[PDB]
Design a protein around this motif. Structure first.
Motif, mmCIF file in Angstrom:
data_model
loop_
_atom_site.group_PDB
_atom_site.id
_atom_site.type_symbol
_atom_site.label_atom_id
_atom_site.label_comp_id
_atom_site.label_asym_id
_atom_site.label_seq_id
_atom_site.Cartn_x
_atom_site.Cartn_y
_atom_site.Cartn_z
ATOM 1 N N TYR A 31 0.837 -1.251 0.155
ATOM 2 C CA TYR A 31 -0.049 0.086 0.127
ATOM 3 C C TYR A 31 0.891 1.285 -0.014
ATOM 4 O O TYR A 31 0.268 2.324 -0.530
ATOM 5 C CB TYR A 31 -1.030 -0.043 1.192
ATOM 6 C CG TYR A 31 -2.257 -0.984 0.823
ATOM 7 C CD1 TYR A 31 -2.336 -1.537 -0.057
ATOM 8 C CD2 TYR A 31 -3.010 -1.014 1.992
ATOM 9 C CE1 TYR A 31 -3.489 -2.418 -0.295
ATOM 10 C CE2 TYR A 31 -4.315 -1.933 1.988
ATOM 11 C CZ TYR A 31 -4.391 -2.504 0.968
ATOM 12 O OH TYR A 31 -5.569 -3.306 0.556
ATOM 13 N N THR A 61 -5.685 -17.723 0.850
ATOM 14 C CA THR A 61 -6.947 -17.006 0.969
ATOM 15 C C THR A 61 -7.159 -16.249 -0.236
ATOM 16 O O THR A 61 -8.081 -15.602 -0.446
ATOM 17 C CB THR A 61 -7.325 -16.495 2.116
ATOM 18 O OG1 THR A 61 -6.124 -15.415 2.545
ATOM 19 C CG2 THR A 61 -7.551 -17.431 3.331
ATOM 20 N N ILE A 116 -5.272 -12.957 0.081
ATOM 21 C CA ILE A 116 -5.135 -11.770 0.822
ATOM 22 C C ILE A 116 -4.027 -10.992 0.129
ATOM 23 O O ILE A 116 -4.435 -9.688 -0.254
ATOM 24 C CB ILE A 116 -4.660 -12.036 2.091
ATOM 25 C CG1 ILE A 116 -4.779 -10.689 3.076
ATOM 26 C CG2 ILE A 116 -3.221 -12.334 2.252
ATOM 27 C CD1 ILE A 116 -6.030 -9.924 2.990
ATOM 28 N N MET A 156 -5.156 -9.558 -3.437
ATOM 29 C CA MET A 156 -6.187 -8.531 -3.084
ATOM 30 C C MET A 156 -5.398 -7.109 -2.910
ATOM 31 O O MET A 156 -5.549 -6.267 -3.434
ATOM 32 C CB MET A 156 -7.054 -8.722 -2.086
ATOM 33 C CG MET A 156 -8.068 -10.099 -2.609
ATOM 34 S SD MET A 156 -9.676 -10.151 -1.868
ATOM 35 C CE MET A 156 -8.830 -11.009 -0.201
ATOM 36 N N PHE A 157 -4.301 -7.226 -1.945
ATOM 37 C CA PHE A 157 -3.385 -6.199 -1.673
ATOM 38 C C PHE A 157 -3.081 -5.539 -3.123
ATOM 39 O O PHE A 157 -3.226 -4.278 -3.325
ATOM 40 C CB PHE A 157 -2.277 -6.419 -0.712
ATOM 41 C CG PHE A 157 -2.668 -6.592 0.610
ATOM 42 C CD1 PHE A 157 -3.781 -6.055 1.333
ATOM 43 C CD2 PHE A 157 -1.802 -7.437 1.506
ATOM 44 C CE1 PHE A 157 -4.028 -6.376 2.667
ATOM 45 C CE2 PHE A 157 -2.162 -7.736 2.677
ATOM 46 C CZ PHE A 157 -3.326 -7.104 3.527
ATOM 47 N N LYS A 178 -5.494 -3.636 -5.161
ATOM 48 C CA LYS A 178 -5.907 -2.390 -4.559
ATOM 49 C C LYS A 178 -4.829 -1.373 -4.858
ATOM 50 O O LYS A 178 -5.277 -0.298 -4.913
ATOM 51 C CB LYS A 178 -6.364 -2.496 -3.242
ATOM 52 C CG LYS A 178 -7.516 -3.125 -2.819
ATOM 53 C CD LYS A 178 -8.876 -2.853 -3.960
ATOM 54 C CE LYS A 178 -9.148 -1.353 -4.083
ATOM 55 N NZ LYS A 178 -10.283 -1.180 -5.046
ATOM 56 N N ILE A 219 -13.869 -15.494 -2.119
ATOM 57 C CA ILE A 219 -13.277 -14.386 -1.250
ATOM 58 C C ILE A 219 -13.129 -13.246 -2.396
ATOM 59 O O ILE A 219 -13.643 -12.054 -2.019
ATOM 60 C CB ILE A 219 -12.313 -14.620 -0.309
ATOM 61 C CG1 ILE A 219 -12.365 -15.497 0.633
ATOM 62 C CG2 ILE A 219 -11.435 -13.432 -0.288
ATOM 63 C CD1 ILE A 219 -11.356 -16.132 1.442
ATOM 64 N N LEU A 271 -16.664 -11.932 -3.348
ATOM 65 C CA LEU A 271 -17.043 -10.919 -2.263
ATOM 66 C C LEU A 271 -16.507 -9.593 -2.185
ATOM 67 O O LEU A 271 -17.340 -8.687 -1.875
ATOM 68 C CB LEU A 271 -16.711 -11.482 -0.829
ATOM 69 C CG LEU A 271 -17.477 -13.080 -0.422
ATOM 70 C CD1 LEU A 271 -17.222 -13.539 0.809
ATOM 71 C CD2 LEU A 271 -19.017 -12.641 -0.406
ATOM 72 N N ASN A 272 -15.194 -9.446 -2.525
ATOM 73 C CA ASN A 272 -14.469 -8.201 -2.505
ATOM 74 C C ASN A 272 -14.518 -7.455 -4.172
ATOM 75 O O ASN A 272 -13.781 -6.593 -4.475
ATOM 76 C CB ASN A 272 -13.127 -8.339 -2.172
ATOM 77 C CG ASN A 272 -13.057 -8.748 -0.663
ATOM 78 O OD1 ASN A 272 -13.323 -8.037 0.088
ATOM 79 N ND2 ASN A 272 -12.980 -10.026 -0.308
ATOM 80 N N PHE A 300 -10.709 -6.593 3.802
ATOM 81 C CA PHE A 300 -11.402 -7.740 2.803
ATOM 82 C C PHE A 300 -12.393 -8.702 3.544
ATOM 83 O O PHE A 300 -12.136 -9.038 4.549
ATOM 84 C CB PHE A 300 -10.242 -8.456 2.019
ATOM 85 C CG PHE A 300 -9.462 -7.509 1.342
ATOM 86 C CD1 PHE A 300 -9.933 -6.729 0.105
ATOM 87 C CD2 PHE A 300 -8.228 -6.856 1.702
ATOM 88 C CE1 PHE A 300 -9.043 -6.126 -0.728
ATOM 89 C CE2 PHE A 300 -7.431 -6.175 1.102
ATOM 90 C CZ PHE A 300 -7.982 -5.678 -0.114
ATOM 91 N N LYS A 301 -13.565 -8.699 2.920
ATOM 92 C CA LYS A 301 -14.482 -9.811 3.282
ATOM 93 C C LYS A 301 -14.012 -11.099 3.013
ATOM 94 O O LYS A 301 -13.691 -11.379 2.195
ATOM 95 C CB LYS A 301 -15.752 -9.619 2.656
ATOM 96 C CG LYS A 301 -16.562 -8.141 2.826
ATOM 97 C CD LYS A 301 -17.903 -7.935 1.817
ATOM 98 N N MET A 302 -14.118 -12.054 4.216
ATOM 99 C CA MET A 302 -13.545 -13.505 4.049
ATOM 100 C C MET A 302 -14.704 -14.222 4.623
ATOM 101 O O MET A 302 -14.723 -15.525 5.034
ATOM 102 C CB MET A 302 -12.391 -13.884 4.643
ATOM 103 C CG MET A 302 -11.169 -13.055 3.780
ATOM 104 S SD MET A 302 -9.695 -13.672 4.404
ATOM 105 C CE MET A 302 -8.637 -12.712 3.349
ATOM 106 N N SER A 303 -16.285 -13.743 4.887
ATOM 107 C CA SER A 303 -17.350 -14.317 5.332
ATOM 108 C C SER A 303 -17.530 -15.823 5.059
ATOM 109 O O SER A 303 -17.804 -16.629 6.001
ATOM 110 C CB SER A 303 -18.517 -13.500 5.213
ATOM 111 O OG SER A 303 -18.386 -12.412 5.869
ATOM 112 N N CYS A 304 -16.980 -16.324 3.974
ATOM 113 C CA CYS A 304 -17.477 -17.646 3.245
ATOM 114 C C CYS A 304 -16.608 -18.533 4.218
ATOM 115 O O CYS A 304 -16.944 -20.013 3.836
ATOM 116 C CB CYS A 304 -17.405 -17.770 1.842
ATOM 117 S SG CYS A 304 -15.815 -16.982 1.196
ATOM 118 N N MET A 305 -15.677 -18.300 4.685
ATOM 119 C CA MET A 305 -14.691 -19.211 5.543
ATOM 120 C C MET A 305 -15.594 -19.829 6.797
ATOM 121 O O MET A 305 -14.862 -20.648 7.500
ATOM 122 C CB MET A 305 -13.393 -18.389 5.963
ATOM 123 C CG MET A 305 -12.344 -18.237 4.804
ATOM 124 S SD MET A 305 -11.659 -19.707 4.206
ATOM 125 C CE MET A 305 -11.133 -20.345 5.823
#
Ligand SMILES: N=C(NCCCSC[C@H]1O[C@@H](n2cnc3c(N)ncnc32)[C@H](O)[C@@H]1O)Nc1cccc(-c2ccc(Cl)cc2)c1
Ligand SMILES: N=C(NCCCSC[C@H]1O[C@@H](n2cnc3c(N)ncnc32)[C@H](O)[C@@H]1O)Nc1cccc(-c2ccc(Cl)cc2)c1
Lengths: 301, 301
Positions: free
Chosen positions: A24, A42, A44, A47-48, A51, A72, A75-76, B165-170
């Motif tokens: 970032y 996952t 992560i 996704m960083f 963005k 995931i 969802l994002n 970040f959303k990881m709700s499905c986990m």
């Protein structure tokens, strides 16, 4: 395949905030770039990278965690940017010829025990463009002397009297096993010594087996019971905001903790003494051969 | 095969002192008896049994730890009394027709998860003499209600926001996994309920799959976030000095800790409420089906 590995890695703030802060705070490294996340988990880090302005992110993982990553990413709302591919990075077909940036968290206990560095270096050699970048780009391994007669008695001399029975012959089976655990910084009795320096731009899988002479500058007259190992991770190349973290005992605890080599025969050292020894790492699982005070022991983890 | 399992079991004082105290304080049970130690490990229980006056002790273990036991028995000068046999208790040839006493530490998490009870009951049926004894002879499993919104948020709601970040499905992958851990007794919100009673003299491997209605007498108005399970071990038959230990949260910590079933949907309960549910254990690894507040979940460990 298991969520538990990913939970412990994501809950390590030193680890995950280090990757987050690198990405970032240095978005010029990712802007309009093609990025490969080797062993994405996952997702992560993918996704960083998205963005921070990535043109395309390729997250690759061999395990069932990728199916969680597919959901995931959705969802994002990043499926526009992040493509996820299931399989070994050595095996899969990528929908690009070349990538600008490789990112990975490949690091094992004592950096190299059950590490993915092999798979990242494969990815570099196959897919990194002329003048591309790999992150983290610089790693070091250090040793430090320990005095902890109480923890040594609790693991070794313990076997001499077990509810009144001799179990002394068990000590031969305990000594050769490296321990992973968080050391009390009060038990350190030397300055650390660097034994290994890796630049992921210039190393090969053969460089990861190494020998190093070392010198431990003793800071406290004491019994030396153990040598502890740890590693430092650096993000440097092209950074306006360099990031580093240590897994050393004088820094905040990480899920890597420290790797401890118990001495079969503790020996006394004097403040101001330069303790000289030799360490060799073989890849084989990983073994560490340690020569110190005129005796040699081989450890595994 | 690994010393680490035996170290953690031997360093559990509640466990090992319970077996030591049973044997040393009830020597009339062992005097001139033929004793079988099923899964003898380091040989510690064989040696207790020998010092209490055993005519012959047969320690059997399938693993490489038996070679350590052979040396340990010799260090303590008990090879006159203790004969060690390598292999599965189901497979090996014993140099006796029958044994007077069987001793074993067979117990898994929540008593039955990855337990040896199967192998001990085989040994009982094959080798226990008419009117022989098995120890420990009595076991129970209990459940207790838990309120811990902070530990529930840390394992479940955590996945909703992971560094932005959303990881709700986990959450779907976490809920069905029993947790093993030491509970704070301050977080208990019910009297315990007995769900299972085993007498090792009168049970068969088919009795170990069971269903039980239960009632949890709520002692604190709160959110119920989890049900915790534990077991109590009794040495009773023919004892002048009965021994018991609990693995429950209100007792000293053991290496078994407690097994925790997280509720997907915490619900409020009122002091004086009789909380009714149903638990079923299937052997298959072990699964636990839990019905509570008009929803059902299956857990594995
Ligand atoms: N932090 C770590 N990083 C190392 C690396 C950790 S796997 C990272 C991911 O890459 C995947 N992958 C591997 N080789 C691949 C390949 N060639 N091609 C494609 N994918 C590949 C794999 O599926 C996974 O999802 N290591 C580690 C070290 C010490 C302790 C722990 C730890 C701590 C606590 C617990 Cl509960 C469990 C484990 C973890
Ligand atoms: N305390 C336990 N007792 C259960 C039982 C534990 S093995 C006991 C011994 O019997 C042997 N054996 C098994 N089946 C056999 C057979 N049929 N025939 C002959 N031998 C047989 C086997 O080789 C071994 O040596 N369980 C346990 C439960 C929870 C946690 C842990 C634990 C905690 C910490 C760590 Cl570091 C590792 C494990 C251990």
């Amino acid at each position: 395949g298991h969520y538990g590995i990913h939970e412990e890695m994501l809950k390590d703030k030193i680890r995950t905030e280090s990757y987050r802060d690198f990405i970032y705070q240095n978005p010029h490294i990712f802007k309009d770039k093609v990025v490969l996340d080797v062993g994405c988990g996952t997702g992560i880090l993918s996704m960083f990278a998205a963005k921070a302005g990535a043109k395309k992110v390729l997250g690759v993982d061999q395990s069932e965690i990728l199916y969680q990553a597919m959901d995931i990413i959705r969802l994002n709302k990043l499926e526009d940017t992040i493509t996820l591919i299931k399989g070994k990075i050595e095996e899969v077909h990528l929908p690009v010829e070349k990538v600008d940036v490789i990112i990975s968290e490949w690091m094992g206990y004592f950096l190299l025990f059950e590490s993915m560095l092999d798979s990242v270096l494969y990815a570099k050699n196959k897919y990194l463009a002329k003048g591309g970048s790999v992150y983290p780009d610089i790693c070091t391994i250090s040793l430090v002397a320990v005095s902890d007669v109480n923890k040594h008695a609790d693991r070794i001399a313990f076997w001499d009297d077990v509810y009144g029975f001799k179990m002394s012959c068990m000590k031969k089976a305990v000594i050769p096993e490296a321990v992973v655990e968080v050391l009390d910084p009060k038990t350190l009795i030397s300055e650390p010594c660097g034994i290994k320096h890796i630049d992921c731009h210039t190393t090969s899988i053969s460089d990861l087996e190494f020998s190093s002479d070392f010198t431990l500058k003793i800071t406290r007259t004491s019994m030396c019971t153990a040598i502890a190992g740890y590693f430092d991770i650096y993000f440097e190349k092209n950074c306006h905001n360099r990031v580093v973290f240590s897994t050393g005992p004088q820094s905040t605890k990480t899920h890597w903790k420290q790797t401890v080599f118990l001495l079969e025969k503790p020996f006394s050292v004097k403040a101001g003494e330069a303790l000289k020894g030799k360490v060799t790492v073989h890849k084989n699982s990983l073994t560490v051969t340690l020569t110190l005070n005129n005796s040699t022991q081989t450890y595994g983890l």
